[PDB]
């Protein structure tokens, strides 16, 4: 698949993924980056008070996106 297809669906895994763990959030994607088969998207949470940044790594395996990695730092 394209350059583009595959960063919007690795985006929407992550982000589907974060929204799951956090329910009552609303969730915006700063930056999504490819290297090879893996996708990085960063995300960032701002709600009660607190700033939580997020980094979770997408893999594409054949033709399937699925989370590898998740992290997060919480601030403020």
Wanted: hydrophobic share 25%; proline share 3%.
């Amino acid at each position: 698949p394209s350059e583009e297809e595959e960063k919007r669906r690795a985006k929407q895994v992550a982000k589907e993924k974060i929204l799951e763990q956090n329910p009552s959030s609303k969730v915006q994607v700063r930056r999504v980056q490819k290297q090879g088969n893996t996708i990085r998207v960063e995300l960032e949470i701002t709600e009660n008070g607190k700033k939580t940044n997020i980094t979770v790594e997408v893999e594409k395996q054949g033709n399937t996106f699925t989370v590898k990695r998740i992290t997060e730092t919480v601030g403020s």
